[PDB]
Design an enzyme around this catalytic site. Sequence first.
Site, PDB file in Angstrom:
ATOM      1  CG  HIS A  91      -5.670  -2.781   0.122  1.00  0.00           C
ATOM      2  ND1 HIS A  91      -4.830  -2.318  -0.867  1.00  0.00           N
ATOM      3  CD2 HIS A  91      -5.303  -2.144   1.258  1.00  0.00           C
ATOM      4  CE1 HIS A  91      -3.986  -1.443  -0.351  1.00  0.00           C
ATOM      5  NE2 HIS A  91      -4.252  -1.320   0.938  1.00  0.00           N
ATOM      6  CB  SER A 113      -1.040  -0.078   1.135  1.00  0.00           C
ATOM      7  OG  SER A 113      -2.025   0.928   1.007  1.00  0.00           O
ATOM      8  CG  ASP A 150      -6.586  -3.140  -3.757  1.00  0.00           C
ATOM      9  OD1 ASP A 150      -7.486  -2.477  -3.207  1.00  0.00           O
ATOM     10  OD2 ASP A 150      -5.399  -3.070  -3.378  1.00  0.00           O
TER      11      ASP A 150
END
EC number: 3.4.14.5
Lengths: 820, 820
Positions: free
Chosen positions: B788, B678, B756
């Site tokens: 994610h 991320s 995601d």
Amino acid sequence: LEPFYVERYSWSQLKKLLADTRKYHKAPHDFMFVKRNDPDGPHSDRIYYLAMSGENRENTLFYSEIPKTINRAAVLMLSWKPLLDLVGIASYDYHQGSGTFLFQAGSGIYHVKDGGPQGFTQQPLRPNLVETSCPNIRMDPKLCPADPDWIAFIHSNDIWISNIVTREERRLTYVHNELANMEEDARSAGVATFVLQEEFDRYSGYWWCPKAETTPSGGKILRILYEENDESEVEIIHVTSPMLETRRADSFRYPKTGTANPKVTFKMSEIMIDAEGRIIDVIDKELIQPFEILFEGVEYIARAGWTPEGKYAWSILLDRSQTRLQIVLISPELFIPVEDDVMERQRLIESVPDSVTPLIIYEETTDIWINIHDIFHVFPQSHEEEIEFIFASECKTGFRHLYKITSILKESKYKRSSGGLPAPSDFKCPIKEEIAITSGEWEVLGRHGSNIQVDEVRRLVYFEGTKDSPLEHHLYVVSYVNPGEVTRLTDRGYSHSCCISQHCDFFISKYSNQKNPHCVSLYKLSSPEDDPTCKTKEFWATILDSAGPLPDYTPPEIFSFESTTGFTLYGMLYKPHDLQPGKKYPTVLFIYGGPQVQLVNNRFKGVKYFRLNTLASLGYVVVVIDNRGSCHRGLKFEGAFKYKMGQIEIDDQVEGLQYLASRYDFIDLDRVGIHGWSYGGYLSLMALMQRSDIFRVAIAGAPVTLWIFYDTGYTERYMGHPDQNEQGYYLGSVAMQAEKFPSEPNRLLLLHGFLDENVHFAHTSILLSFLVRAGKPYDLQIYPQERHSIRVPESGEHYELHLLHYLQENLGSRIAALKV
Amino acid sequence: LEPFYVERYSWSQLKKLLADTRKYHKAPHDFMFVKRNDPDGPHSDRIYYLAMSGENRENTLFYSEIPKTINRAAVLMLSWKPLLDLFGIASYDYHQGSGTFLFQAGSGIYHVKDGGPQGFTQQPLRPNLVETSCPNIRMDPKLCPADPDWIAFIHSNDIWISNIVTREERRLTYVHNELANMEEDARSAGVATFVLQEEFDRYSGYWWCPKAETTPSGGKILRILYEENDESEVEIIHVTSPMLETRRADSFRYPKTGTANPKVTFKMSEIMIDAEGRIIDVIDKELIQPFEILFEGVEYIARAGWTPEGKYAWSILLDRSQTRLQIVLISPELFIPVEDDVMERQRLIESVPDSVTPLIIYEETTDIWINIHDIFHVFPQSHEEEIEFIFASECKTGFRHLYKITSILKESKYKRSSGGLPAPSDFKCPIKEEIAITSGEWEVLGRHGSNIQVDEVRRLVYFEGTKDSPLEHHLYVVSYVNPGEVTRLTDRGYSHSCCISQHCDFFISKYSNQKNPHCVSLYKLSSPEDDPTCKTKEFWATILDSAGPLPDYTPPEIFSFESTTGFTLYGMLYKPHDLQPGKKYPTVLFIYGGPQVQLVNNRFKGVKYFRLNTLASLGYVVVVIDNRGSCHRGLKFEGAFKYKMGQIEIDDQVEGLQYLASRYDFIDLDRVGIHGWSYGGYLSLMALMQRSDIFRVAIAGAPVTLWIFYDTGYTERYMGHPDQNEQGYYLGSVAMQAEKFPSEPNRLLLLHGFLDENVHFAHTSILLSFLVRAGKPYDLQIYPQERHSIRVPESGEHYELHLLHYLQENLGSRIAALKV
């Protein structure tokens, strides 16, 4: 015997090498002959054609002057005269009585006049824009052969017409709504749907009737046959939108194998024009009984059109399994106006005679498959109750051949007013005559531009075939009355692609071989006065001269070998440049290996397969082999993988590879790589799955990993329905067998255009899903801006760079050997 | 110094090594204390809590018995007694007076009683299924606190209620139609939208009034405050569906930075009920004037609820830039019935007094940003002119502290009858008192379950904070009347996550440190007789025991350094196992580096970051550094990267890396890698882009490559509006600077979950398109089943396998040196 290790260049250096070798690097087509008819003038014909004349140039119309005589001591080079004043023009129509050209160039539809009563221009003509009030892009424009003032085109999946002198514009069909989303509004008119364009090469869905019916008041009726499709029940697929910023996806009607194709039918638009050329009225008409009743068992409308006089419409019709073909005549009297009122509608059904009925003039079957083609010629109607025609088929002997057929237009047993459904055979005409015009262990060609030209005066048929060799296409002529021997008109040692004048006194050939780039030359056809059957040719002029044997391109050599399967299998061998004696080199098999394609033939490969030579120059042996299933070898050769795709192809590749390894000790069998695109990517995966003993690395581009994902028209020809071939689909799908891939890394490379609507990216992502589940290693490259082909140069440059670096680092070089 | 090289294990050996180290491998939470009230019995309390009993089991309610006395020579292990026997549970509701549990388990909503008038079970309870006619899944069930017969829930984006004794079921809102597709129907009621769940951690959009107003007839009125959202103007985004065989994408309302958030307002549902539980009528009510007029400049409804007496609804409201926060009281009298008739509606508008007005009881601002939290306690109203409450804020000092505030509920200057619009400050209440309860260079915690517990008898407030250390969370207690000494209740040497019993006589701590896995223990609170203000604690019983110092895990050691930027920065160092003298090892920087996260603290990292230890066992130095921007260091530290994300973070990483290199010879700075997910993937890309001199390899997981693709709530908080920060957005976006990536391959690995929805895959696909355009190399791994997070075990195993192998082949081993 010592292993050769390729020079280990960096990424930056390989980019330079590729850019330097690329730095040095569309032929005339869609020819047409028009006679001058000027006794005092020096020219017999003017040829018109589409071409570029430059590396970065629009495709446009040119003309050249064909002289009545030549200097036979010299070689005439025809000068290209621009027809038009200032990608481009992909095709064009022509109406000979008036000289009217019609073509699309970008968004616009334009017209010019040359060769008619107006005469012949000596300077570029100005394109005349066909004006419109249609907000969106107009597609598929066609001249009305009965009246060259009128054209038609598609706008937002409906048919429109437009008069190019009066500027009148009318919409004929009201089936689609431009403002509605595709999920609710899935009907179109005049347009071929996805499967037809992609898997049958039909691009239009409407056909002008070539003759006008005159009316009492001194006007006329123009007519348009068209297919109407309803895609409401067809599955909806989402493919990523090219504008990646949006993070959106386009909707797309994709009939995947074993699910519903579109609901199709025939329709007829009847356009009434008055004396002044203005539209009185437009009556939309439909079949008197529905499509499923009149044409039992028919899934696909493969081809369609009209007879020369416009009396009957015709169509070539396939069943779902594509093992039954029918040629059907469809009368305009079978069409009645579309009526909402059932009382008035019942009267219109009873008004049309029971004698008027579909006429299945030909029917054939096979237990392999029907390969659709463009050969279909209809002679003038001599008698009212007969029709003569030439067709081609693989059904009789297993090779495509021409047949002269006469069918009897019988009144049907079935009566409509009796109020029952017709039996399957009720529309079948009886066959009076069926003469084989050709025969042998070789095929007549009918796809990708190959067709027949019929001289009706001398009663001959010109055609292309593989009679002299499966590695060369040649022009041939033969009588259709007393079919005897077949006269070859093109010279051996090249493969030819030919066009014959409508007047049958000239032909053009685009020809090449492994050594020489493509040429285009004009040849005059003569017959000795005593026998019009006998046909001779004479070189007249060059249209496009060959560039000549290129520097820094060594061609491959064509080999063959007798397979244990009982077929000769052909191949191409690129020897690595500068062979060191007593050294064995890494090998790269390039493969396609699916139906409808032959990679190995006597043609120039220095344009499309230039990087195979680049691999050879770095020290890779390159091999290409047409396994069983490829085309130009007959139906039985093609049929070898029916129900069994993926199971046989790699046996032929290996057998050919081992043939070469015995006869040539420079082939290192410990360092073999495999690469291909589409079906070639599919087989590259199968090769690594099945024969990891032979293949070190596999590079799979846009691979079919799962046959259930691919469309109806293709997949059901070769594999049938998934419900009736559960084992074939399983064995032929790489994503259902992910455990068979190696646990060794640096062996699998997957490549895919992210926006591919043909072989969906899904094929790769689902393969990866199961590879991840099975703990298997892979390498991946995506091309985010590409569909099934690679169009943007930067993507292609990156592809070639990564491919060379991958082969170097994991197959060719010394560092690759150390990685084990 | 001689370079150490890691062992070259094969893919199969690494898989085996990872599986063997994994083979040996969810704590109690959502505690609640219920008194027994049995003078003769041995237990004072029963504690209920959610937990997972075994490894693979579901999450359910358990309970344990708290004894009145204990054997202080021994250690009491509380046994977990299952509450349920279901023939799972993420949360539950409970009504003290009745003993009614309400919870969702799978598709069903259940209720069951324990620990009220009906007594205490000594075995598992079989719950009662709540009856419904609703076809789709029911979400977010809540008991009415004023009547445990009534529940509310969400169904197809509308609020419903049902009665668990009478079985009446009524729909309260008619805002969404499930039949119509997402593209046209964008209205919802009672549901927090995407941004508020992801970026503000608000999961509900409706709040039961805690009290019932009695009617003269004998029944009562129940009330539900709710937000109504209109997402029509919010952008639609398509995300690939998990069922990959469909080849479809799902639609998603995603407000990307700089574009429209949902149009929001408050509504009030009035449920009139008769004397015996039956519904009489439902009146849906809207704000007397529009939301935009009453709450000027407010984008976000961050938090909402009711005061304990049920007199006012409250809300915490933010402006778009998230630099202004307001706490607002909203009377039920501000709502009027929804009316179509305009004349009857103007009667209702005039029937509400001018004195009834929204009351802004608190307002604050900042040049950095407002961090939303869950601390807000409102005391009982002694006077109708005043409201007392405790709130927390960083706006006064730059560190989060508790403040007791008293605001005067005044009559406003603005009159509706006057027919104008209210000015900005017209609803502001003057501040009578604002006492600081805490202060210092340390923070109170108010997120992820951290909150306060107020003891109104003893006049104390329990809270969590960083006072003793920024590396440890501890429980504290302080008076809110005469605030002075802050008393720590948890023991130094561990970091604690605590909750306090509602009765303020017990607290529970989940605690760990770097050496010891997490434990959960119960502690009894008491005071000495001379001072009720003073709090001592005593160990009572263990709930979850330690695993003990874990075998085959070696924890890192925490370090720090005095940065040139003026802050102490903290880090973790994993030394290589079997550390040889006179040798230098490859280094792997693991990174997050974004806001709201702290990686370096005194907690057990042997579960979540177990593979950092695994890397150290293979001979890698592993470093983790909390750069500027990370949390638990005050707002000024956090604000360092405002308007310039991606520009300062790597300076700190490199500074800390160079600090370690000068103090330790074993760090080989020629072979440093970086990896994160991320924001950590983002910074890994920036690290390679900016500082390719330092970092050899970068493995980017789910990276933000393009800040314009990310949402409003996050991006605009830290980076502002794109027009007001054109350079920060450009410099902060790695996809916009693709030319800065290396021309050397084997340096860039991209990892991304294909499905995601948070960091879209298009961040990767767009980065790849620019990398392709710029002739740059990359490696790519996709996880086709993942969003994610990586949830499916196979995906996690493959990720770890491939990452080790990549680090080995391109950073650690002997082959990695020969590759360059």
